[PDB]
Structures are given as C-alpha cells and as structure tokens.
Design a protein around this nucleic acid. Sequence first.
DNA 1: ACACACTCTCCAATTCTCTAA
DNA 2: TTAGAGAATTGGAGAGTGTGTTTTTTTTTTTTTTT
Lengths: 92, 51, 567, 656, 81, 364
Amino acid sequence: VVIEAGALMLADNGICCIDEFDKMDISDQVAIHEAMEQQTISIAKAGIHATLNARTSILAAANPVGGRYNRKLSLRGNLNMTAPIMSRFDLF
Amino acid sequence: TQLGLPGVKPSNSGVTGLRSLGVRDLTYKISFLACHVISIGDQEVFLNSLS
Amino acid sequence: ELGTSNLNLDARNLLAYKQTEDLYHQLLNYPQEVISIMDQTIKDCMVSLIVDNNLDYDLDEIETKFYKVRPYNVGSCKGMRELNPNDIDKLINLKGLVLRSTPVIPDMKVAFFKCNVCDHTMAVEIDRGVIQEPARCERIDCNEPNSMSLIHNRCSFADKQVIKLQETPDFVPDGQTPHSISLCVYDELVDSCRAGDRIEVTGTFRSIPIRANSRQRVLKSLYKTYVDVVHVKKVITDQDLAKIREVAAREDLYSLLARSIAPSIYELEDVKKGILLQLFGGTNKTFTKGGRYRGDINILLCGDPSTSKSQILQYVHKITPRGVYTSGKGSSAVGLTAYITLVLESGALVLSDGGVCCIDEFDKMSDSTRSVLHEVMEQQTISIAKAGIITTLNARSSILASANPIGSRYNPNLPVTENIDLPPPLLSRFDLVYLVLDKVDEKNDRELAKHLTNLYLEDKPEHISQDDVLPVEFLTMYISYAKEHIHPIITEAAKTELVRAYVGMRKMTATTRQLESMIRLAEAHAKMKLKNVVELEDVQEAVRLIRSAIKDYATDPKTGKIDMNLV
Amino acid sequence: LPSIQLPVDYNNLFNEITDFLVTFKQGPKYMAMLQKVANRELNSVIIDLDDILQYQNEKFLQGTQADDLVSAIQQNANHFTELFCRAIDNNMPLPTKEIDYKDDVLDVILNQRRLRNERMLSELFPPNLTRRYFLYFKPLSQNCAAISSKPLSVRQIKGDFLGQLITVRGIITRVSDVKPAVEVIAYTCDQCGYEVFQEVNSRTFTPLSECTSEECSQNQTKGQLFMSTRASKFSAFQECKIQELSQQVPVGHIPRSLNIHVNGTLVRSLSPGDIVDVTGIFLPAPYTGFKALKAGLLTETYLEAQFVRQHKKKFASFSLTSDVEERVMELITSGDVYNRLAKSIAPEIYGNLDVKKALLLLLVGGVDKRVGDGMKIRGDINVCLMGDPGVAKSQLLKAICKISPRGVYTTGKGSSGVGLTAAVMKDPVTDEMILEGGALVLADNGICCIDEFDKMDESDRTAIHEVMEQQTISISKAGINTTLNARTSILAAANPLYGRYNPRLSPLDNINLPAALLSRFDILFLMLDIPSRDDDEKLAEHVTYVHMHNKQPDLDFTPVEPSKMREYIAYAKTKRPVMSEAVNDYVVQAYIRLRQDSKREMDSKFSFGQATPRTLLGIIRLSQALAKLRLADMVDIDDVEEALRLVRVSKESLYQ
Amino acid sequence: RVTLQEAPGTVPPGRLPRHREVILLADLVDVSKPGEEVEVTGIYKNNYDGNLNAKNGFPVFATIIEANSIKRSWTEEEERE
Amino acid sequence: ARHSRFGGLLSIQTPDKTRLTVSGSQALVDEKIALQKLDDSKKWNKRIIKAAEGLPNSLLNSQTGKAIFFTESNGKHFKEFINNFIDSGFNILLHSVTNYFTTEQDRMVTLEQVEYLLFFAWFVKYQLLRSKIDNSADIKQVSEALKEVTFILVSSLLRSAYDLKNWTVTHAGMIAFNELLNLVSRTKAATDIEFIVSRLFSDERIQLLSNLPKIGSKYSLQFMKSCIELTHSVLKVLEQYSNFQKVQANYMTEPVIETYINFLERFRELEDDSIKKVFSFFHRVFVQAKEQALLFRFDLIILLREMLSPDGLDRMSRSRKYVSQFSDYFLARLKKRLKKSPAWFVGLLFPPLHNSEVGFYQRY
DNA sequence: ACACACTCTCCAATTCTCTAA
DNA sequence: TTAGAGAATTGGAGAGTGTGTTTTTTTTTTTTTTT
Ligand SMILES: Nc1ncnc2c1ncn2[C@@H]1O[C@H](COP(=O)(O)OP(=O)(O)NP(=O)(O)O)[C@@H](O)[C@H]1O
Ligand SMILES: Nc1ncnc2c1ncn2[C@@H]1O[C@H](COP(=O)(O)OP(=O)(O)NP(=O)(O)O)[C@@H](O)[C@H]1O
Ligand SMILES: [Mg+2]
Ligand SMILES: [Mg+2]
Ligand SMILES: [Zn+2]
Ligand SMILES: [Zn+2]
C-alpha cells in the first residue's frame, strides 16, 4: 500500500531470482510460500480488497548452515529451510 | 491552485504582480508531453513476424 | 578560441596592482554592483580585442554571449555560527561538507504576452521578482484595457538549485552537534556537487522576509538567511611529469612509498605495503558478456590490543580522496547501505563509492549487520526491494577493517581460524588478512620506547621516524596520476607463474578466490611502477605478501597453531 | 476611557536619571563609558542598581529628599529602558578620536536627505535608527539587599510578576541558532527619488506600498515604493528554554519551563546543560490581527534576558587578574601544595591518601599532543577503583563530582550504551531523524563518573571503547552519518567477582575485565577491607566525631576551600611542561624492566596481565600532571619516580 | 454506491486491476453483496471535479456508471429422479 | 547576464546636486537605458481622438500589406481570367458604365460610387505593372480611362464627395484620381493628353488638391498614406510640365508638415517605399525651396533619434542611407542658426510666431 | 476587524462646435 | 485668421458594499515485558 507492485508481480510469466535465501526472515519466507502455493496474491486492508495473478517460477540460492556442507547429514540437516518450502522445489 | 480555479481555495519563491494573482505568488513544474511510446526491454503469428 | 564564458579571479591580484588597491575593499562591501561592473568590462574587452587586432571571429557571436567573472580566495574563512547581522550583503567564504542537493528548479527570467483580440505580442523583462504586466494593449488601433494575457510555455527560464552544507567538526562548540546552512546556486554550477563532497565556497550572505500566510502581504519580523554562491572549490605541468617519472626510476621506490603513507608509525612495514597496494588498486574489467570484475582490494587487520591498528586507519581516512571512517557499535544495516525516507537515501558504503571505507571495532557488530557486507563485497552492487522502491545501485568501495580476536588477546592454544572467529563465507571475501602480535622483546622495546619518548622533547615536534619521506601532496599526485593513466595487462609468463603458484598453494585451504586476489595484487604492484605489463616479478611479490600476512611460515601445517618462538 | 491618580511622576525620575549619569563616581563613572561609545570602541552599557542605591544614600546623607528610583525601576522595568536611552542620547559627548565616518551608509543617506531639505527650504526619522549601543540593568547585590536579588524556581513565577525585573534559577534545555530581526525598515520611491522609514515592534507587519509624502502628493506623483536592506536596521536574536532542577520537583508532578529571549551583545551566552542564575524582565506576548479577536484573554509569556550568572567557572574562562594572583601566591608561598590539595579532597573520609593523590592527578591531567604528520595522542587520564563493599568508593566518587566544573554521574544498571554515548531519535511529529548526544558528550572537556561498573551489561560496555582512547564518537545510522567530539576522562568503581575479594584466585580472576578494556585505564586501584583492632578504633573515633560536630576532627591540618582549590587547579591547567633527554633515558629504561617482569610472571599468582605500549604513555601523562601542579615548565626526574611509586602502590593491598 | 473491480481471470499478465464506481437507485439497492462477481448495464457519465483538476494540473473530468440493470429450484422430474 | 534577484541599486545625481533612484543591473552601465527606464515608470498617458462605416471590407479600411494565397493552378487560372478580361472586355465595359453614370449621377448611392472608383483603380494599375514587366503587354488595352467623359466623372465624384464631407467616397476618389495621373505620366513618356492635363490643372483643382493633405492629420493611417502618394505624383507631373513656383509655395505650410510627421512616426508598420516618399518631400522643403524654418520643431528631433537608433530601422535597409544623409545636413544648418541667434533655444519647443514685425526676421 | 475584490456614483477635465472681430 | 463662449463626452476619485480568516500501513531506532 502507498497499491504498488512487488517483485513477484513484475516476474509474472517470468523467472524470479532470490540470492542468499537462507538470510530471509521466517515472517517473509512464509509470504513467498503462500504465493508459490497458489500462484496468486491477495490484499485486504483499509477498506481496499484485491486479488492478483503471480504465474512466476522461482530460482533460489542458499548457504549450508555453518558455511560448509556436511556429508554425514541429509540436505534437510544442512539447510536452514522449513520442510513445506523444501517440498516445493522441483530440483535441488 | 493559485489561479482562479472554480471551487478550490489557494494553497523556492515564485513570481508575482500578474492580474489574476492579485498579491499571490506563482511557481512551476517540468514535465514531458510525449506523442508516442516504443518498448526496448501461436507459432503461425510468430513465423509471420520473423524475417 | 576555446569558446568559453567564465573567468576565475583570485582577489589578491587586486592588491598587487596599485590602481586597484581600493577596489579590493569596495568589492567586499558592494558585491552586487561591483561584480556587474566587472562583467560588462570583460565583455567589452573581448570585443575590443577582435576589432582592434582585426581578427576573423564573428562579432555577432561575441555580442550574443554572456561573460561572467567569478572571484575567489577573498580572505580568511568565517565560522558558520559567527555570521552576524552586520555581515548582510557582504562577501563571505565558508568551508564544509555537502549533505544533499534538491533537483533543478525552473526560474523565470522573461515573460511573454499576447493580445486576446488582435494577436499583438510583447516580451517583458523580470526584475525584483515582479512581472510588469501592461495596463492596455499597446497596438495603436487596439488600445483596449485588460486585453493582454500571459503564455507560460513561450516564456524564458533559467536553472536554480539548493545545496545543503554542514559545519565541519573542527569548529563545533564543546558538548554540541554540528549545524548547517543552505546555498542557492545558478546556471553553470548547478549539478556540480554530490552527497559527501567536501568544498569551500564564496558568495554574498543574504537575508529576506517570509509571509505569515499565502493570502496577504503580512510579513514576519524574523528574516530568513542564506548564501548566494558565485564560486565553488574542492579542498598537469611538464615539471610534475618530470618529477613523477624521475621518482619512479628510484631503486628504493617500493619501500619509500610504503614508509611515507604514515610517517610517524614505527615499523609494521608489511601492513603499510599492503595498504599502499589497496590505494593503487587493480584494473577494472568489463566484457561484452560474462560480466565485470572488481579492481578493488579488501583488507582485514586482526590482532592484539595496543598494536596501533586504529592509528593506521586515521592515516588512510585522511589520504584517500573519498571515504568514510566508522565504528562497529555505531552502524546499522540501513545506515551502512541505504535508507527509505517516498524517497531513497544513501548510507556509508554508497557515499564511499570509488574510495575506501574504514570500519573499526569490526568484531562488535552483530551477525545481522555483518551479513549485509556479503553482496556488496562480492558484486560491488546493492540490491533493494521494499514497499514502493525496487532497484540496484553501484558500490565500487574498498573495505579496510580492524578487529581483536576472541578472548580479546591472541590465544596460542587455539588454531588461527578459531581465534579470528569470522564465519567462512565472510572471511573468504578479504584479499589480505593480517595477524599482528604484541610479542615481548628487549631489542624491539628499547627502539619503540626511544621513538615514542622523542616526541615529547619539543612543544610542536619537527621530529619524524625517517630521513627521507615524500610530502603528502606529491604522494597524492603520484597515486592519482598512476590510477588515471596506467592500465597493466597479463603477460604469458605471468599466466604460467600464476597457474603454478595456485596449484602449489592448492595441492596439500586455498579457494578459487586466492587466484583472483593474486591477479589483482599483481596488477596493483604493476601500476605502482608505471608499467603497462604484469611480469614474473609482480606475481612473485603478490604471492610473497599473501604468505607473509597470515604468518604462514610459522604455522603448523597440520594442527593450524602458530609457534610463538618463530615470530 | 477612565483615568486614575498614581504616586509616580516620570519628570522627577527623568531629572534624577540625568543627574545620576553625569555625577556618580566610585571623572564620573558612566561618562567614561559614553566616551568609549562615542569613539565607536564599545557596544553596550550595563547599569548597576548598586550605584543607584549608593547614590540615593549619599544624596540622603547630604540632607535632601530623593525618590526611590531603585524600587521604581524594579516595579515597572520596561519603561525605564527608554528613559535611560533618551538621557544617554541627550548627554552623549563628542568623539575624542577620528572615526572614518564615510564607512556609514546611514550617515551618507541622512546627510543627503538633510541637504535635500536645505535646498527645498531655499521628526525627520525615528531615533532608534542611529542608536549604536545596547543597554541592560544588573540586579541588586543580595549582600547590600529586594526580590530581584533572591532567586526563584520556575514554579514560583506566578502571574503577579508580569512587568517586573526578576531572577530565575534552573537548567537550560535547548538553544536556537542566531537569526536577524528588523527594528527599522527603509524604502525608496522610484519617481520622486525620496526615502521613507517604518518601525517594527510586533511579531508581524504590513510593508508600505504608496509614497504618502506631501511633496510627492502635491506633484500628483503616485510613485512606487521598494524595500532596501542596505539602509535597514537589524539586531541579533536568539531564543532558549529553561527548566527547573530535578531535585526541586514536588512528588508526583511534571517539571515546568520558561521561554527566554536574548538580543544584542548578550547573544550566544547560554548553552544546553548549564546550571545558571538568569535575570531579566518577565512580560506577556500579545496576539495580532484576526487571531486576537478570537484568542480570548489567556496570554502567552516569556523572559527578556538582561544578565547571566554561572554557578561554576569553566576552566576555559580563566584569566590571571591580580585578584586571583594574590590568592595563588598564598598557596605558592605556603608550600607543599601536593599534600595539602590531596588531603583537602573530601575531608570527612579518613585515610585513603594515595587514592586521593591519584584522583587529584585525574583532575589535572596530561598534555595533548599532535604530530606534524597528523597523528594525535590522548591527554586525558582514566582511573578505576576496584574493592570490597563498604570502603567509601561511591562516597569518594560522588565527592569528586562536586569539584569539577563540568561533570556527570551515572550508574551501571541505569544506563544504556546508546544513551551513554549518543542516540538517533525519530523525535519530531514530522518523522524527521535527529542526533542527540549522550552522557559522554555532555561531559565533553570534563570528568564522567560511572558507579557500579561491574553491573553494566558486557555488550553495552563496548560502546565506551572508542571514547576512552580516541576521544570521539562515530555514528552511521538511518539518515545520519557524522562524528562528534568527546574529550572526556572516565572515573569508574566496581566490586570484584563474587563481591568481597577472594584470595583463592589470582587478581585477574577477581578483576574479571577483558584485556582491551583493562588496558584503557591509566591506573586501577585495588582496595581491600581487612580487620584490625588498632585501625578500626581510629576510624571509628574519627567517624563518631564527624557525626557529633558536622566537622572533620582537626589539630594540625586546615583544608583549602573548594573555591581556592578550583582557582589553583584552573591556573595549573595552562602550563604544558616539556620533557628532557635526562628524563627520557630514565623512563625508557624503566619500561623495559616492566615488560621483562611481566613476561617472567604471566603464570604466577602475582600476575595482572601484560604491560602494553599504553603503559609507557601512562607514565608520561602522570609525570606531566605532577609537573603541572608545581607550576613548572619542565618535567623533572623527581616527577617520574613519584609517578612510578603511585603506580606501584596500587597492588600492595594483595599483601595484607 | 458500489465499487466494481476487474475479475482476476480477465486481467492481463503483469498488470494491476482497474476500478470503477457504480450508483444504485430506488429499486436496485442491496441487490448485491461484497465479493460477488456481477454484470452491469447502464449509462457511462462524467462530471467536473475541482480536486482532480487541482492535483493533475490539466482540465480533467471524472467518470461514473449509472446502473440501469444488474445481473449475476427444481421440477417434479428432478424429485422423481 | 545574472538573475532577476541579484540586482543592486543605482543613484543618479543631476546638476544642482539632486538625486534619483533606479534599479536593475544594466542601468549601472547604460545611461541611455537608465534615462529611458526612468520616464517609463510614470503612469499617465493623454487620452486620444479618432472615419468610415457601412460597407464591406476592402482597401479603404484595412491594412493591405497582407496577401491571400493561391494554388499554382489557381494562380495561373486567375491570371488567365483577368488577363483575357483586360485584353477583351475592359474598354467596352468602362465606356458603357461611365456613359450611364453621367446621366444618373444625382441618383447615386454610396456603394455604387465606391465600386466604380475601385474597379477603375485596380485594372489601370495592374496593366501598368504588366507592361512595365514585359513587351508583349501594351498600354492601349486600358486606354478608355483617359477620354474626356470619364475624367470629368472621376473629378465630379471627388468634388461632390469632398464638399458634403463624406470621407469614404472622398477616400476612394482619391485612389482613383491617383491612378489617372500615374497613367498620364506614362503616356507623356511616349497630343490630346496635354489638353487633358491643362484641364486637369485649372486653378480650381489646384485649390482642391492642395487642400487635401491638411485635413488628413486627424484620420486613419490609410487616409494619410493616400494623401502622400497622390501629392508625390501631383508635384512630379508639374515638374515635367517644364506656374511651378506659385504651385509649390501653395503646398508649404505648417498643417501639411504636421501630417507628414504624424504619419512618419508610425514607421514600424509602413513599407520601405513610403519612407522614400516622405524624405523626398523633406528634401524638397529643406534644400530646394530653402524654407528651413518649418522643420525646427522638437517632435521631429525626437523622431530622428528613435528611427535612427540601433532600435528601429535596420542597419542595412536602404532607409538608413537616406535618413543619415538627411540628419547630417539638418544638424549642420541647425548649428549655424543657433549660434547666429540664441533665441531659437526657446523657439524649438513651440510653433512659429505669426506677428508681422518680428515674424519676418524669425522665419529667416 | 482587518485587508481585499468589486460596484456604484458624481463631478470636472477635456475636445468639439458656432459666432463675431 | 484668431479667439472666446457654450455643449457634449469621458475618467477616475473616492465612496460604498460585501466578503473570508482562527483551529492502515510501511520502514527504523530504542525501551520494556513476555516466553
Ligand atoms: N608501532 C607503533 N608506532 C606508533 N605508535 C604506536 C606503536 N605501537 C603502539 N603505539 C601507540 O599505542 C597506542 C595504540 O592505540 P591504537 O591505535 O588504538 O592501537 P589498536 O591496535 O587500535 N589497539 P586497540 O584499539 O586496543 O585494539 C597509540 O597511542 C599509538 O601511538
Ligand atoms: N575511611 C572512611 N571514612 C569515613 N567513612 C567511611 C570510611 N570507610 C567507609 N566509610 C563509610 O562507609 C559507608 C559506605 O560507603 P560507600 O561509598 O557507600 O561504600 P561503597 O565503597 O560504595 N560500598 P559498595 O557500594 O557496597 O561497593 C559510608 O557511610 C562511609 O561513611
Ligand atoms: Mg585502537
Ligand atoms: Mg558504592
Ligand atoms: Zn490588441
Ligand atoms: Zn514619492
């Protein structure tokens, strides 16, 4: 609200690049998760309601916890990412 | 706003002494009045588009 | 013959010539009239030259142009808080630092009128801000009242801009915060100056009333004040080139330059050398595709307290043309990069673009704040995506950092990486990492004690650590010229040595960044000798300095601890 | 509409004023000042009411009646600024020296205007336009004394005082920067070439726009008026605010404040954080125009400043008048000033003499140094007290807080590292960001006292690191990127780990400070509470006497009072004594021994960490402070050995 | 008065939705509820507005739709089935 | 050069030490501009006086320095139409319409008068121009205008219009009578035509044609221009008659000169050619006739500054040749007069003085 | 009540016309 | 041909009247209670 478009709206029918994903706050990772689940964005505040389309493909980069990967452990053990978000990448 | 717009009251220094202003003060903004726009960022339609 | 319109004039020449000794005083006391007189003198003289010497140049062209004098070096500078109401409309001189500049404002200069009934037109001159509108249409047969009207987009305008200048810390009262003053600037000088610039100016100190409300002529008793600048200054010859080329031929050049960046600091030669190469920098590279590659060097100083790290940061902060000094507990993530305020605003790393950013007490700032530096150091860009603003900005900024180890004194029972304690993704981004240690030794201590106590044998010392050092001005000239004119390239021999050296450090930990930083250091070494090619000697110096900085020879190759006896 | 009688006639008082200005003497006093005004040497006249009281008494003792002008100008002070000015203008003498009159625009303008009138013939302008001076009243001495001599707190200033001359005591909260204010405005008429003036008193005015001059009118010349700065008259203006002392606020209330106005040569006298006795005239501020018609009868109010008295003389304000010279000669001739001055700090505390001597050297401090290449070295001294509970640490610390002219007291638990240093507050309603300095900035060029240093959080204590050694603050936050000056010396107090000192562990275990911070104190004093039937008896006899008499027990020793002590210290902080080669060799050789001994014993129970290069400069600073106190221009080896002894004694408490 | 917005399926990719406002009179009030998808027939109409002119600085008129009509059980056979 | 709020202030001191004030940065250096700017502030202007109505727009009441615009096909088709009209129809049309109107003059209405006089004028002028250009054309085609009946009729229209003070017909009749004279000088530059001249310049008509510029001073800018061009032609014919001294002295007096200056000062609007005509007349008054005393009057001296300044007439127009060559001689003779008799300093403001005993020495 | 915008009204300054010396 | 007596047209001086005015985020630094 200012309504003005964010990054995922500009990347509709396009590729959206997230660098150092692991540094993003949980409070914002969940927003990306909700958008990625539906390819849809919703606004409802201050008497204004809107729904928008977000047919965007995501390309992400991340750091293993502690800076170096551990061959003793699963990718889930190595990566600071919640299981529902991890479940929605086609390739790692 | 500083001119005689019907139904609206008046609102780095400007210019003054003009008839319509009375004792008021007038300033200006710069903008561009364009005349056309060009962007620079079905297979049959696509093939007809190509050379 | 160059087709240009403005003439500089330092006011001291008016005192040298006997006929103008009193004109100097009249200039300071009556600037608006005297400067106008000077302008109309210069233009007439220019005409007289072509008509007397009967030259081919177009008289109409010279008659069309405006010519302006710009006086400077008028006298002593004046403290911003000490301007008093007896200084109004006199010439002033100020020193300070630039905070921000507003966008260019159109200022009207000529008005254009057209008759509504008979289409007669008149151009009118603006003076004292008031439009002198005609009472009646001036065409003889159309002598009618209220008949003329203004046409906005056929008027003529001029550029105005407002600059915000801040008081330099040298003048602030005890226990107080610096003030600021606003400068009005016109035409030629409009877009000259950026945020973070440091300047000296010259202009009339003016004052004006302000209205109580926009409806009526009622004025307030307090008057606004500002400065109306006529000149701005920042705070070549074949002889300079001869001196530079002659100095570059000396055998002891590398040691001479290094010991001369910080003359009063005792030894620490390798630290000084690394800092010198940071000042020169590598070469900037851009491809048609495959991107651009940074020329800048990042350095970290780590070690025991009292070792004079912060004293070295002072010298670098004053030598560099552009740069910032700051502290770990003084910096936020926003303040270090950029700030939303709807408008965007610059932080330290953006103000420091093309310069050196000095960060002290680096070990006190949090992991949250330090995580901001990853992207800026690797890419030299800042990406932002917040409500109403999304963009990317350039940051060609060199970092010089200072820290103390975990436990606050270097512990020889832990490996080096555990004493330094920065996480690997951030420690991997520095080109040079220095360990400096407070090792006891009677030989060292007697020399250090004699050096520091010698400074107290005089009231304002003439004493200095070494017989032969270069003055700061000339050293600045050398570094600046070498940055502009010299651009070294890789030789095949240098390529072979770099591949060999990287495989040597790698086969045993050296990352791929050790290779690129070696290339960059070798390029910096080549510029410092005014060579156009990187050679085997330069590559070997780059390798040697990397091995020396992190005390590698004294390091246990398997356990990672340092034998203090070998230091 | 109606009218009344009153007991005062201003004609009589005007006659008294004109007699007083030409007759009084301690030639007459005020005629010398008016000669200096006429010579353009002097810009302001300060009237003393003690003179008027003396004049009244002398005229009475000569057997004649006289009006009580002193109460008359206290009761209705505003009107008498005009009467005195008219008297001064009437009686002003002619210049004694050449002036270069042609430098004045007003002289040229008025001369030409007079010549125009002279030609035409073949008040002119308001007198305020040519008053080259300012005038202020100074209140009655309380020791001669009347209300103007007796300070009021900001609550006691009721509505009864409007119009009177009063004195106010409090702390300044904020100060504005200087800007000009009009008094007389000047205009030019284009067609008839004639000039007119307008005088401004209210907060707002309407400028003139028609040439109403009779000659211009009779030539039917409806010319246009234009304003001019070059012949207008301005005066410097500044606005401040004063607030009551926090220790005088009654329970459950919020502190009150007053607006102060300042004009003329009195400008930029006040500063934020000052404790001060301001005196001035208390007045209302009327509304203007349409606002007045619907503002009601409630009036805004403010104080016109006339004179300012500070409670403590800052060390920068010192100059050696012979009045001060005579007093420092008492101490100089008496001799052994080091011991007497140290013994005079907090006489109600028994013993602790070496601690007091160290704190005296803290009050004096070393010499600032700045090398030819731009390096600079700290002159301030930092001190720390480490000891058991109940040994007068907080008491002694708070006693030194009285002597220093600038200083602040703070405790570890009540303090934020931000508020201790400097804060970036989003303070205004306009969403603007503004920087506001903390305690270490308010203590600039003074002492900062930090009690309960061991309770302060480990993260917040790191904020002090930059200020301690570099004497500056650096901030880079939202919208703000600047460096501030903080030339302050720190004094701190703490208990060891576990409270009472534990002999089972080493000194470094008990101290529990990191190496980088422990090095930044020039002296750390260790003081332990060990029982002894003999010493406990003497201490108890001393303290019981003090509770009985409110006086320290004395047989031989008379302490110097704090005022004379401040004069001596202030005089001593001007000397800048230099070192010499003979001294340099001695300290150079001492330093080697300290580091060798440290290296030998890093393992030992008697360890205190390792001697860094900052321990050499500590010796130089203590030595130079000792050289200052003996008013020398040269450091002596006698100073160096004392500076080494004073460092050695700090550790002897470990040996019972 | 009712605010009407483009249905999300109709909006082109990478563009924000547009809005208009509709006036409902005597028989048509409370014919529809927030969040419904609705179809409207009416006159398209405009008027002067001082604030629009003041903010934009051009003689720009405001527009509105005046609705004329608005749009969005079983038989025995179903019961027997 | 510098902006509108930079400006200082200027003071100017007169003789007798009195001072004035003016603003702006150019006033500091240019006294001519300061003097002009000083008077320009003053409010008043004297209010002013003002001839034709009832008929459609034409040459009589519009400024004709403004064409109308033709396609190429239209240009050639129009040229063909009126060229064939002239070669075919003009004499036969004029002969009929004129020998009508002699029998019907008393019954006329204003429009028919103004039609006849502006059909005559157009076609005669156009033919003269066409044969000036080329030899294929000839003057015989328009030769019906000269025969005696039409000459009488144009004369009679001008006469009757002047007496009843009908100024629009008088204006058109002035235009027609101009062309007849122009055509006569053409034909004399090649028998009956001299007879026609002698009858055209009977004394009665010289009284009328002398009278006509005097009243022009009040009226619109075209009327005065018609008077000038007619006067130029009228004198030039009588110059090539060889009487002349009687006739020229008839023209020279104050109220004619008044008209000439009143017309000349609106030169920003006029042609290059008309100013050639005015200075021809001043050369006649000043040098030849040696009646110098008429032009020593102040509003002429103002005029020559305006027009001659870098303000007005272009630095390279042919006008400046004539003007500067005139003013040089003017000021030489003025210098001589003023030093011989200093009373003319107070003379230069006012009209000349018509007393018998002093006036003769005054004028000479 | 205090600056402004706008309307109304009366009076004399001005130019035009007629008459006689 | 001058001039002076009478009539008509226009300007703006100035007097009068009515009028308007006070007065849900989103981003970023800092203190505080809550798990
Ligand atoms: N080699 C040296 N040359 C000159 N001065 C020195 C040297 N070694 C120590 N010093 C002095 O010792 C002090 C060092 O202060 P500083 O610059 O803050 O060191 P530092 O490495 O930053 N120590 P710290 O801030 O505790 O981590 C200064 O007074 C220096 O002048
Ligand atoms: N030498 C002494 N002379 C006089 N009074 C003393 C002395 N030693 C201790 N006292 C008394 O001890 C009391 C407590 O002093 P105080 O300064 O509060 O102790 P402290 O060192 O700050 N202890 P703490 O805050 O618990 O670490 C005061 O009332 C002093 O009068
Ligand atoms: Mg340091
Ligand atoms: Mg205590
Ligand atoms: Zn017009
Ligand atoms: Zn005037």
